[PDB]
Ligand binder design. Structure first.
Ligand SMILES: CCCCCCCCCCCCCCCCCC(=O)OC[C@H](COP(=O)([O-])OCC(O)COP(=O)([O-])OC[C@@H](COC(=O)CCCCCCCCCCCCCCCCC)OC(=O)CCCCCCCCCCCCCCCCC)OC(=O)CCCCCCCCCCCCCCCCC
Ligand SMILES: CCCCCCCCCCCCCCCCCC(=O)OC[C@H](COP(=O)([O-])OCC(O)COP(=O)([O-])OC[C@@H](COC(=O)CCCCCCCCCCCCCCCCC)OC(=O)CCCCCCCCCCCCCCCCC)OC(=O)CCCCCCCCCCCCCCCCC
Ligand SMILES: CCCCCCCCCCCCCCCCCC(=O)OC[C@H](COP(=O)([O-])OCC(O)COP(=O)([O-])OC[C@@H](COC(=O)CCCCCCCCCCCCCCCCC)OC(=O)CCCCCCCCCCCCCCCCC)OC(=O)CCCCCCCCCCCCCCCCC
Ligand SMILES: CCCCCCCCCCCCCCCCCC(=O)OC[C@H](COP(=O)([O-])OCC(O)COP(=O)([O-])OC[C@@H](COC(=O)CCCCCCCCCCCCCCCCC)OC(=O)CCCCCCCCCCCCCCCCC)OC(=O)CCCCCCCCCCCCCCCCC
Ligand SMILES: CCCCCCCCCCCCCCCCCC(=O)OC[C@H](COP(=O)([O-])OCC[N+](C)(C)C)OC(=O)CCCCCCCCCCCCCCCCC
Ligand SMILES: CCCCCCCCCCCCCCCCCC(=O)OC[C@H](COP(=O)(O)OCCN)OC(=O)CCCCCCCCCCCCCCCCC
Ligand SMILES: CCCCCCCCCCCCCCCCCC(=O)OC[C@H](COP(=O)(O)OCCN)OC(=O)CCCCCCCCCCCCCCCCC
Ligand SMILES: CCCCCCCCCCCCCCCCCC(=O)OC[C@H](COP(=O)(O)OCCN)OC(=O)CCCCCCCCCCCCCCCCC
Ligand SMILES: Nc1ncnc2c1ncn2[C@@H]1O[C@H](COP(=O)(O)OP(=O)(O)OP(=O)(O)O)[C@@H](O)[C@H]1O
Lengths: 51, 120, 105, 344, 98, 54, 171, 140, 320
C-alpha cells in the first residue's frame, strides 16, 4: 500500500545481498621522515598503512 | 493447576494409581482416528515426494499407523488418569467443605410463579 | 520449576543455595537465619495463598531482621528527641557516651 | 561452519532453555537466556551480509537490555527477601519490570518493532528457531510465576500484540515478516491467558510451533520469501498447496482445524473470569489476522499465477527436501480437533 | 546501605536510559551495558556481604563472566558493522525496512 | 443504496479504516534509536501506571 | 569519616551519568574505570576485598580492548568529549542539580527509610562476627569448586563456546 | 491521582457539568500526549519546532474531543433527565467524532468517529452500569 | 547413501581426491573455431571427461530417458527461428539466451559434482562466465530490449558468486571473415543468414570483457586457429602451468562441502533463475503452463520420481 513515505521504498533483493556503495580504502599515510633515526637523515619514505 | 497436588511425582507418565483405571478398548474411535491420521500422513509424504499413493511405502504407512496408535494409547491412558484425578479431587473437596455447597432442594412449578409473556 | 528434572533424579544442582539459611561454606550463620528458617518451616505443606496469611507474623519478623526499618526509625526518633533536648538546654549525655568510660574487660 | 563448531553452538542453544527450565535459581534462568542469545548470533550472521549483520546487532542489543532488566529484578528480589526465587509478597514494580523485559525478549507489542526486521534479515532456518525455540524459556519464566502477575498490563500487552500483528501482517509482501507478525499475535493470545490456567499457554505454543515449522519448511523447499515466489508453486511443487492451505486456515483460527481450539478454549477460560469484551476484541481482530492468510492462499492456490520459462528445468530435475516430518506436523495440525479433550 | 543501594539503582537507571537513548555511535551503548553490569554486580555483592550469605558470592562472578561474553560478541558484531559500512554509525542500519 | 451507500458504510469503511491504521502503524524505518525511544516511553508509562494504581 | 560510603555512591552515580551521556568511548571508558574503582572501594567499605579487586582487574582488561577497538572503528575526527556540546554539559549539570535536589526531597518526604542524612554511617555492616576466622569473601567464591560446582561448569562452558562464537562471527 | 478521575462517578450525569468536562479534557490531553510521544519518537519531524507543533496539535485535538464529550454527556443528561441512559454517551461520542472530523478536515472521518466513539461510550456506560470489569482479577 | 555432513566426517572429503589434473577448463571462442575438436582431444590426453556445449536440450539429456523432448518442454525457443527472425515480437531471443544460461549453469554444477566427488578434471566450452557475449551482441543490435539485459545481469549477480571460476580458459580467436567463411562452409541455412556485426560484437565482448576479468582469476591461454590446430601443443602448455591467482587456493574441505551440497541440489542451483521478475518474454501464463505441466507429467518415465514408475519397468515399488 504506497504511502507518501513508503513510495521510495525499493524492494529488497532475492538472495538478501544488497548492492552497496563500495567505501574507499582510505589507508593511513605516514612520513617515515628524514629526522627518523632508521632513515639515514635524508629519507622521506611516504608509506600507506592498513594498521 | 494440579501440579501442586500432593503425591504428584515429577515427570511421571503413568503412576500406579492409573493402573486402577480401566484402559481403552484398543478399538476406540479416537485411536482408529489416529490410525487414519497416520495413514493420511503416509499418503501425504508420498504425494510430496512424487511417489505413487496407496502403492509405494507400505512399510512406511504401517509404521506411521503403528506409531500413531502406540502413542495415542498411552497418551489417552494418561489423559483419562488426569480427568479422573480432577473428578476425585472435586468430589473430595465438596465432601470436605459441604457448607459452601449446601444440600439444596427446589420447589415445583405449582408453588413458584414465572411471568407469562403473551406473543400476540 | 517447569521441568522438575532434579527431583526426578534426586540431584541438587542449584536448589541448595536458594535462601540465606542454607549451608554456608564454613558453618557461619547468615543473619536472619532463624527468621528465614521459621518462615520456611511455617510455609511447608501449605502452598502460597494460605501461607501468605497464616505465616505473616514470621514474614514480618524476617522482613524486619533483613531490611531493618523499624529500628532505623526508632533510633532516628531517639536521636531527634535528644538533639531537641540538648538544644533546649535540658539533657546532658553521661560519661560513657561522650567517650569517657571504664572499658569492661 | 565446521562440525565441532556446529555441535558446540547447537548444544548451547539446546542448553539455554533446558537450563532455564531445570533451575529454581532465577540467576541460572538468566544464564540460560544468555546462552540462547550468545549462541543464536553465529547462525543469524552465517551468510555475512549487511542484512545479517543488522539483524544480529538488533537482536543482541534488544535482548541484552532485557537480560539486564531481568537481572535488576532478580537482584532487587534478593535484596528484599534474601532468596533467588520470586516468592509471593515481592514488589509489583519488580514483577512488572520482569514482565516488560520478558515481553521485549519475546516480541510482544509495543516491544515488537525488532522481530519482523530480524526475521527478514536471516534465512528461513533461524527464523524457525527464533520463533519457536527462543519463545519457550521466556514463557517458562512467566509460567513459573503466573499468580504474581498483574492482570491489567498482561492483557494490555496481549491486546496490543493482537492489533499490531494483524495490522502489520496485513500489508507485508515478504513472508518472513508475515510469520513474525503471526508470532506476535499468537504470543498475545498466550500471554492474555497466562494468569488464567497456564496450560492453555503451552497448548497454543505447541499449536503455533506445529503450524509455523511446516510453513517455514514450505518456504525452504524453494527458498520462497515473497508472495510472487510462493505463487510459482503450482509449477514447482504442486502437491503442497493442500497442506499450505489447511495450515494457513489453521493459523487463522477456523473451526474444523485445530487452530481454532486455542482461541476457543482461551475465550472460554477468559469468559469464566469475566474478561468478556477484551476477549471479544481479540477474537474479532483475529479475523484481520486471517485476511492476509486468505489473500496468500488465493495468490498461491486458487488463482494460479503466471510462471516463467526457466521453471521447466525444475520440472525435469528431482527433489529430496521434504523431511518426513512436514506431513506429520501438518496432519497433526489441520485434523486434530476431535482429540481436543486429550489436548486442552 | 539503603542510601548507597538507592544510588546504585539510580545509576543502573541512568545507564539504562543511556543505552535506550542512542547516539550516532554503538560502542557507547555497549559501554552503557557494561555500566549496568557494574551496578548490578555491586548491588549483589553488597547484599551478600550485608546479609553475610557467602553461598551467593559465586553469583557476581558469573554475572561478570556472561556480561563480558556479551561485550565480546557485541564487539565482534562491531567489527562486522565497520567492515560493511566503514564508519560504525547506527543510522546506516536502515535497509531491513525494505 | 445497494451499489454505493451500503458498500460505503459497512465494507469499504472497514477496509479504509484498517488499511489506514495499517499504513500509519507499520510504516517504520528500521532505526534502533526510534524503537528504543518508544521502549523508553513504554517503560515510563508502565511505571506511571503502577505509581497511580498501587 | 562516616559519609565515606555516600560520597563513593554519589561519585559512582556521577560516573554512570557521564557514561550515559555517551561521549567518545575514550572518555566513556575513562568513566567506566573511575566508576569501577569506586565500586571496588565501596565493596571494600562493606567488607569485601576480592570482589572489588576482581571488578577493577576485569574492567581494566576490558577497557583496554575497548580503547584498541575505538581507535579502529568508533573514532571521529572530532571525538566530541563532554564539554564539546553545550547541551550535554547542560544535561550533566542538570543531572547533578537533580541529584542534590532529589536527595534533599527524599530527606523530607519520609523521616527515614529511603535516604537518611542525619542517620548516616550507623547502618553499614549489620551484625559482624567480632570473633571469626575463615570469614572473608574468597571462601564463598571458592565454593564454585565445592558446594556450587554448577556455576563453574556453566561459566566455563560459556567461555569455551564464546571462543567458537567469536571465531565464527569474525570469519 | 486516580481519585481525580474516579470522581467522575461520585455524582451522576446532569450534575457538575464543568467538573466532568475538564476531567474528560485532562484525560484526552493525557492520551494525546501519549500519541504525540509515539508519533515523534517513531516518524520524527524535520525540526523540534515541527515536532512541538505536532504535539500541540494532537494534544489540543484530543482535549477538544474530551471537552465536547463531557459537555454533551452532562448536557443531554441535564436535558431529558435520564442519567442511566447510554444514549447520552452515544451523542457525546458523536460530538467527539464530529470534532475529530473538524480538526482533521474530513467528513468520512467525522461519521466514522461518530459511530465508533458513540458505540464505545454507550458500551462504557453499560459497563459502569451493569458491573463489567475490564482487567479482572483471576477468580475462576 | 546421499552425501552430507555424515559422509564428510566418515571421510569422503574432497582435498584427498585432487591430484594434479583435477581442473576445470573451458574452451571459448566465436561461432566456428574448433572447440569441440580441441576439448575432446584435451580430455583424451589429460584424462578429463569432455562435456559438450550446453544447448537447449541438456536438462532433457541428463534426466529420464536421456532423449530430447518436444520444443515446449525443454524450453519454447529455437535457434533457427532466432537466426531467421531475431527481432520477433515473440521474444525468442532472450528466451533462448536465458534458457542457455540456465543450461550452462546446470552444466557447470554437474561438472563440479563430478570433480569434487571423483577428483577427475572436467573440460567445458563457453560456460556461464562467457554467456553474456551473445547477450551484448543482441543488445548492440536491436534483437532485445534493455529490460531483458537487466534481468540477465540480475540472475548472474544471484548465481555466479556461489561457484568457483575455471582454473584456466582457452580462448581461440579467428577474424570475422574467417569465421563467416567457416560458417558458409559448415552447411546450415540458418547459421549462414547471420550478420558479421553479430560476430564482431561477440569478438569485441570476448576480447574486452571476458579475457581480462578472468585473467584476474585464471590462466588465459589465448591461441589462434593454426595453434587451435595441433592440440597437443595446448595440452603440453596446460601440463606445465602454475595454477596460481585464484580463489581455489583458499578452499579447504568445508568450503568444498558446502559448495558440493549446493551443487548436489539442482533446484538450489536453479532457484534464482525462476524468479518472479515478470518479463513478457519469459512469462508463460497459467493456462499454457498448466497444459505443459500436465502433458509433461503425462509422459513415460515422468509422473512420479525416477525409481517409482511401473510404466517403465521399475520394480519393488511397494517396498521402497
Ligand atoms: C489420542 C491422541 C491425542 C493427541 C495426540 C497428539 C496431538 C498433537 C497436538 C498436540 C498439541 C498440544 C499439546 C500440548 C500439551 O501437550 O499439553 C500441554 C502440557 C501442559 O503441561 P502442565 O500440565 O500445565 O504442567 C506440566 C508440569 O509442569 C510437568 O510435570 P507433570 O507432572 O505434568 O509431568 C510431565 C509429563 C509430560 O509428558 C507428557 O505426557 C507431555 C507430552 C506432550 C507432547 C505432545 C504429544 O511427564 C513427562 O515429563 C514425560 C517424561 C518421561 C520421563 C520417563 C519416565 O505441556 C506439557 O506438559 C509439556 C511437557 C514437556 C515435557 C518434556
Ligand atoms: C474404518 C476402518 C478402521 C477400523 C474400524 C474399526 C471398526 C470397529 O469395530 O470399531 C469402530 C469404533 C468402535 O466401535 P464401537 O465401540 O462398537 O462404537 C463406538 C461408538 O461409535 C461411539 O463413538 P462416539 O460417538 O462416542 O465417538 C467418540 C469420540 C470421537 O472420536 C472419533 O472417532 C472421531 C470421529 C471423527 C468425527 O468422541 C465423540 O463422542 C464424538 C466427537 C466427534 C467430534 C467431531 C468434531 C469435529 C467435527 C468434524 C470436523 C471435520 C474433521 C476435521 C477437518 C478435516 C479436513 C482436513 O468406532 C469408530 O471408530 C467409528 C467412528 C464413528 C464416527 C463418528 C462421527 C461423528
Ligand atoms: C482442500 C484444499 C485444496 C486447495 C486447492 C489445491 C489445488 O488448487 O489443487 C491443485 C490444482 C492442480 O491440479 P494438478 O496439477 O493436476 O495436481 C497435481 C497432482 O499432485 C498430481 O498428482 P498425481 O496425478 O501424480 O497422483 C494423484 C494424487 C492426487 O492427490 C492429490 O494431489 C490431492 C488429494 C487431496 C484430497 C483432498 C480430499 C479432501 C477431503 C475432505 C474431507 O494421489 C491420489 O490418487 C489421491 C489419493 C487419495 C487422497 C490422498 C490425500 C491424502 C491426504 C488427506 C488430507 C485430507 C485433508 C482434507 O490446482
Ligand atoms: C515444553 C518443553 C519442550 C519444548 C516444546 C517442544 C518444542 C519442539 C522443539 C522446537 C521445534 C523447533 C526446532 C527446530 C530445529 C531446527 C530446525 C532446522 O534448522 O532444520 C530444518 C530442517 C530442514 O531439513 P533439510 O533442509 O532437508 O536439511 C538437510 C541437510 O541439508 C542434510 O545435510 P547436512 O549436511 O546439513 O547434515 C545434517 C546433519 C545435522 O546434524 C546436526 O544436528 C548438527 C550437529 C553435528 C554433530 C557432529 O545431520 C546429519 O547429517 C547426521 C548428523 C551428523 O527441517 C526440520 O528440521 C523440520 C523438523 C523440525 C522439528 C519440529 C518438531 C516440532 C514437534
Ligand atoms: C571524569 C569522570 C567522569 C565524571 C563526569 C565528567 C565530569 C567532568 C567533566 C568536565 C568537562 C571536561 C570536558 O568537557 O572536556 C575538556 C577536556 C578536553 O580538553 P581540550 O582537548 O578541549 O583542550 C583544552 C585546552 N585548554 C586548556 C586551553 C582550554 O577533557 C576533559 O577534561 C575530560 C578529562 C576528565 C576530566 C576530569 C577532571 C577532574 C580533575 C582531574 C585532574
Ligand atoms: C526522554 C525524552 C528525550 C527527548 C529528546 C531530548 C533531546 C536530547 O537531548 O536527548 C537526545 C539524545 C540523543 O542523541 P542525539 O540523537 O545525537 O541528539 C543530538 C545531540 N547532539 O540522547 C542521548 O544522547 C542520551 C541522553 C542520556 C541522558 C542521561 C542523563 C539524564 C539526566 C538529564
Ligand atoms: C457485519 C458487516 C461486516 C462486513 C465486513 C466485510 C468487509 C469485507 C471487506 C472487503 C473489502 C475489499 C474491497 C476491495 C475492493 C477493490 C477496490 C479496488 O479497486 O482496489 C483499490 C483499493 C484502494 O482503494 P482506496 O480506498 O480508494 O485507496 C486508494 C486511494 N489512495 O485497494 C484496496 O483497498 C484493496 C482492499 C484492501 C482491503 C484492506 C483490508 C480489508 C480488511 C477487511 C476487514 C477484516 C475484518 C476485521 C474485523 C475487525
Ligand atoms: C496510562 C494511560 C493509558 C492511555 C492510553 C492512551 C491510548 C493511546 C493510543 C495509542 C497511541 C497511538 C499514537 C498514533 O497515532 O500512532 C502514530 C504513530 C506514527 O505517527 P504518525 O503516522 O505520524 O501519526 C499519524 C496520525 N494518526 O504510529 C506508531 O508509531 C505506532 C505506535 C503504537 C504504539 C501504541 C502502544 C500504546 C499502548 C501501550 C500498552 C501498554
Ligand atoms: N548463449 C548463446 N546465445 C545465442 N546463441 C548461441 C549461444 N550458445 C550457442 N549458440 C549458437 O549455437 C551454435 C553453437 O556453435 P558452436 O560455437 O558450439 O560450434 P561447435 O559445436 O563448438 O563446433 P565449431 O566451433 O567447429 O562450429 C552457434 O551457431 C551459436 O549461434
Amino acid at each position: 500500500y504506497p504511502s507518501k513515505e513508503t513510495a521510495h521504498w525499493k524492494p529488497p533483493p532475492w538472495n538478501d545481498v544488497d548492492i552497496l556503495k563500495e567505501k574507499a580504502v582510505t589507508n593511513m599515510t605516514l612520513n617515515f621522515g628524514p629526522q627518523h633515526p632508521a632513515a639515514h637523515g635524508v629519507l622521506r619514505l611516504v608509506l600507506e598503512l592498513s594498521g | 493447576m494440579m501440579n501442586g497436588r500432593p503425591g504428584h511425582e515429577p515427570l511421571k507418565f503413568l503412576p500406579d494409581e492409573a493402573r486402577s483405571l480401566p484402559p481403552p478398548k484398543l478399538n476406540d474411535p479416537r485411536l482408529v482416528y489416529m490410525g487414519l491420521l497416520g495413514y493420511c500422513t503416509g499418503l501425504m509424504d508420498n504425494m510430496l515426494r512424487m511417489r505413487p499413493v496407496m502403492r509405494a511405502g507400505l512399510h512406511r504407512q504401517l509404521l506411521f499407523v503403528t506409531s500413531f496408535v502406540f502413542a495415542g494409547y498411552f497418551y489417552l491412558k494418561r489423559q483419562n488418569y488426569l480427568y479422573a484425578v480432577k473428578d476425585h479431587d472435586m468430589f473430595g473437596y465438596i465432601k470436605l467443605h459441604p457448607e459452601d455447597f449446601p444440600e439444596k432442594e427446589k420447589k415445583t412449578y405449582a408453588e413458584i410463579l414465572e411471568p407469562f409473556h403473551p406473543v400476540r | 520449576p517447569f521441568l522438575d528434572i532434579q527431583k526426578k533424579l534426586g540431584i541438587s544442582l542449584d536448589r541448595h543455595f536458594m535462601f540465606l539459611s542454607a549451608e554456608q561454606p564454613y558453618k557461619n550463620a547468615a543473619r536472619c537465619h532463624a527468621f528465614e528458617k521459621e518462615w520456611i518451616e511455617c510455609a511447608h505443606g501449605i502452598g502460597g495463598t494460605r501461607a501468605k496469611k497464616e505465616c505473616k507474623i514470621e514474614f514480618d519478623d524476617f522482613e524486619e531482621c533483613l531490611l531493618r526499618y523499624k529500628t532505623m526509625r526508632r533510633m532516628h526518633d531517639i536521636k531527634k528527641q535528644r538533639e531537641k533536648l540538648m538544644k533546649e538546654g535540658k539533657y546532658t549525655p553521661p560519661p560513657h557516651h561522650s567517650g569517657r568510660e571504664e572499658p569492661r574487660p | 561452519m565446521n562440525p565441532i563448531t556446529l555441535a558446540i553452538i547447537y548444544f548451547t542453544i539446546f542448553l539455554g532453555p533446558v537450563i532455564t527450565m531445570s533451575s529454581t535459581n532465577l540467576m541460572l534462568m538468566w544464564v540460560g537466556l544468555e546462552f540462547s542469545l550468545l549462541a543464536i548470533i553465529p547462525m543469524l550472521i552465517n551468510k555475512k551480509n549487511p542484512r545479517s549483520t543488522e539483524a544480529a546487532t538488533k537482536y543482541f542489543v534488544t535482548q541484552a537490555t532485557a537480560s539486564m532488566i531481568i537481572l535488576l529484578a532478580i537482584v532487587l528480589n534478593y535484596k528484599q527477601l534474601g532468596t533467588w526465587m520470586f516468592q509471593q509478597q515481592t514488589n509489583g514494580l519488580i514483577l512488572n519490570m520482569t514482565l516488560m523485559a520478558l515481553s521485549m525478549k519475546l516480541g510482544l507489542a509495543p516491544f515488537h518493532f525488532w522481530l519482523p526486521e530480524v526475521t527478514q534479515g536471516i534465512p528461513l532456518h533461524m527464523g524457525l528457531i527464533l520463533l519457536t525455540w527462543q519463545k519457550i524459556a521466556p514463557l517458562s519464566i512467566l509460567i513459573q510465576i503466573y499468580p504474581l502477575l498483574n492482570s491489567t498490563i498482561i492483557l494490555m500487552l496481549a491486546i496490543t500484540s493482537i492489533f499490531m500483528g494483524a495490522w502489520g501482517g496485513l500489508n507485508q509482501t515478504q513472508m518472513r515478516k508475515i510469520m513474525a507478525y503471526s508470532s506476535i499475535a499468537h504470543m498475545g493470545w498466550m500471554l492474555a491467558i497466562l494468569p488464567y490456567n497456564p496450560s492453555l499457554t503451552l497448548l497454543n505454543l505447541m499449536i503455533y510451533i506445529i503450524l509455523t515449522a511446516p510453513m517455514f519448511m514450505a518456504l525452504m523447499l524453494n527458498n520462497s520469501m515473497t508472495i510472487n515466489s510462493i505463487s510459482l508453486l503450482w509449477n514447482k511443487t504442486p502437491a503442497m498447496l493442500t497442506m499450505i492451505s489447511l495450515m494457513l486456515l489453521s493459523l487463522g483460527g477456523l473451526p474444523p482445524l485445530t487452530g481454532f481450539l486455542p482461541k476457543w478454549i482461551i475465550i472460554t477460560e477468559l469468559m469464566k473470569n469475566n474478561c468478556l469484551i477484551m476477549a471479544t476484541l481479540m477474537a474479532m481482530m483475529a479475523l484481520l489476522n486471517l485476511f492476509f492468510y486468505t489473500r496468500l492462499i488465493y495468490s498461491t492456490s486458487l488463482t494460479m499465477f503466471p510462471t516463467n520459462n526457466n521453471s521447466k528445468m525444475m520440472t525435469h530435475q528431482t527433489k529430496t527436501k521434504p523431511n518426513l516430518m512436514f506431513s506429520t506436523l501438518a496432519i497433526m495440525s489441520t485434523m486434530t480437533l476431535p482429540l481436543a479433550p486429550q489436548l486442552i | 546501605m539503603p542510601s548507597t543501594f538507592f544510588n546504585l539503582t539510580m545509576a543502573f537507571s541512568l545507564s539504562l536510559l543511556g543505552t535506550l537513548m542512542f547516539r550516532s555511535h554503538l560502542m557507547s551503548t555497549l559501554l552503557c551495558l557494561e555500566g549496568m553490569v557494574l551496578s548490578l554486580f555491586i548491588m549483589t555483592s553488597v547484599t551478600s556481604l550485608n546479609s553475610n550469605s557467602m553461598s551467593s558470592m559465586p553469583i557476581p562472578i558469573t554475572i561478570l563472566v556472561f556480561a563480558a561474553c556479551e561485550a565480546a560478541v557485541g564487539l565482534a558484531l562491531l567489527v562486522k558493522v565497520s567492515n560493511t559500512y566503514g564508519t560504525d554509525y547506527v543510522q546506516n542500519l536502515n535497509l531491513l525496512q525494505c | 443504496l445497494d451499489l454505493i451507500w451500503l458498500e460505503k458504510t459497512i465494507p469499504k469503511s472497514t477496509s479504509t479504516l484498517h488499511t489506514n491504521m495499517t499504513t500509519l502503524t507499520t510504516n517504520q524505518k528500521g532505526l534502533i534509536k526510534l524503537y528504543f525511544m518508544s521502549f523508553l516511553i513504554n517503560i515510563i508509562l508502565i511505571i506511571i501506571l503502577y505509581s497511580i494504581n498501587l | 569519616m562516616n559519609n565515606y560510603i555516600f560520597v563513593l555512591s554519589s561519585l559512582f552515580l556521577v560516573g554512570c551519568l557521564g557514561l550515559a551521556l555517551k561521549p567518545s568511548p575514550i572518555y566513556g571508558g575513562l568513566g567506566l574505570i573511575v566508576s569501577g574503582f569506586v565500586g571496588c572501594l565501596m565493596v571494600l567499605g562493606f567488607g569485601g576485598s576480592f570482589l572489588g579487586l576482581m571488578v577493577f582487574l576485569i574492567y581494566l582488561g576490558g577497557m583496554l580492548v575497548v580503547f584498541g577497538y575505538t581507535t579502529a572503528m568508533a573514532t571521529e575526527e572530532y571525538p566530541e568529549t563532554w564539554g564539546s556540546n553545550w547541551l550535554i554539559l547542560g544535561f550533566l549539570v542538570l543531572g547533578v542539580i537533580m541529584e542534590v535536589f532529589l536527595i534533599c526531597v527524599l530527606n523530607y518526604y519520609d523521616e527515614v527509610g529511603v535516604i537518611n542524612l542525619d542517620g548516616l554511617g550507623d547502618w553499614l555492616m549489620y551484625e559482624v562476627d567480632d570473633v571469626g576466622v575463615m570469614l572473608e569473601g574468597g571462601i564463598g567464591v571458592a565454593a564454585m569448586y565445592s558446594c556450587a560446582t554448577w556455576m563453574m561448569v556453566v561459566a566455563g562452558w560459556s567461555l569455551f563456546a564464546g571462543i567458537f562464537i567469536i571465531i565464527e562471527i569474525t570469519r | 491521582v486516580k481519585r481525580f478521575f474516579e470522581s467522575y462517578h461520585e455524582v451522576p450525569d446532569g450534575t457538575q457539568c464543568h467538573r466532568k468536562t475538564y476531567i474528560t479534557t485532562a484525560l484526552g490531553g493525557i492520551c494525546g500526549i501519549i500519541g504525540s510521544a509515539y508519533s515523534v519518537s517513531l516518524n520524527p519531524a524535520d525540526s523540534t519546532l515541527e515536532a512541538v507543533a505536532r504535539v500541540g496539535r494532537y494534544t489540543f485535538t484530543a482535549a477538544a474531543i474530551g471537552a465536547m464529550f463531557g459537555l454533551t454527556t452532562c448536557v443531554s443528561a441535564q436535558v431529558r433527565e435520564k442519567p442511566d441512559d447510554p444514549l447520552n454517551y452515544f451523542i457525546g461520542g458523536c460530538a467527539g467524532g464530529l470534532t475529530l472530523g473538524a480538526r482533521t478536515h474530513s467528513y468520512g472521518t467525522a461519521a466514522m468517529g461518530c459511530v465508533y466513539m458513540g458505540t464505545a461510550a454507550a458500551l462504557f456506560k453499560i459497563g459502569k452500569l451493569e458491573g463489567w470489569e475490564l482487567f479482572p482479577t483471576p477468580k475462576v | 547413501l546421499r552425501y552430507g555432513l555424515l559422509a564428510a566426517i566418515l571421510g569422503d572429503k574432497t582435498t584427498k581426491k585432487l591430484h594434479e589434473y583435477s581442473r576445470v577448463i573451458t574452451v571459448d571462442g566465436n561461432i566456428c573455431s574448433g572447440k569441440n575438436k580441441l576439448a575432446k582431444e584435451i580430455a583424451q590426453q589429460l584424462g578429463m571427461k569432455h562435456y559438450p556445449e550446453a544447448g537447449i536440450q541438456y536438462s532433457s539429456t541428463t534426466t529420464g530417458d536421456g532423449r530430447p523432448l518436444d520444443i515446449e518442454f525443454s524450453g519454447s525457443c529455437s535457434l533457427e527461428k532466432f537466426y531467421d527472425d531475431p527481432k520477433s515480437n515473440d521474444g525468442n531471443s532472450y528466451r533462448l539466451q536465458s534458457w542457455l544460461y540456465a543450461s550452462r549453469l546446470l552444466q557447470y554444477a554437474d561438472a563440479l559434482e563430478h570433480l569434487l566427488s571423483t577428483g577427475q578434471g572436467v573440460v567445458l566450452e563457453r560456460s556461464i562466465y562467457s554467456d553474456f557475449v551473445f547477450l551484448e551482441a543482441m543488445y548492440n543490435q536491436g534483437y532485445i530490449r534493455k529490460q531483458c539485459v537487466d534481468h540477465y545481469n540480475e540472475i548472474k549477480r544471484l548465481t555466479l558468486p556461489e561457484y568457483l571460476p575455471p582454473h584456466a580458459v582457452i580462448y581461440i580467436d579467428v577474424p570475422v571473415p574467417e569465421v563467416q567463411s567457416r560458417i558458409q562452409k559448415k552447411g546450415d541455412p540458418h547459421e549462414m543468414k547471420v550478420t558479421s556485426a553479430y560476430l564482431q560484437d561477440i569478438e569485441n565482448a570476448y576480447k574486452k570483457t571476458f579475457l581480462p576479468k578472468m585473467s584476474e582469476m585464471c590462466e588465459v591461454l589465448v591461441y589462434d586457429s593454426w595453434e587451435a590446430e595441433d592440440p597437443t601443443k595446448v595440452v603440453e602448455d596446460i601440463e606445465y602451468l602454475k595454477y596460481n591467482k585464484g580463489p581455489w587456493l583458499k578452499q579447504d574441505d568445508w568450503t568444498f562441502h558446502y559448495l558440493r551440497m549446493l551443487v548436489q541440489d539442482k533446484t538450489e542451483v536453479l532457484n534464482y533463475t525462476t524468479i518472479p521478475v515478470y518479463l513478457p518474454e519469459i512469462t508463460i501464463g497459467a493456462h499454457q503452463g498448466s497444459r505443459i505441466y500436465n502433458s509433461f507429467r503425462e509422459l513415460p518415465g515422468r509422473k512420479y520420481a525416477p525409481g517409482y514408475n511401473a510404466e517403465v519397468g521399475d520394480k519393488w515399488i511397494w517396498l521402497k
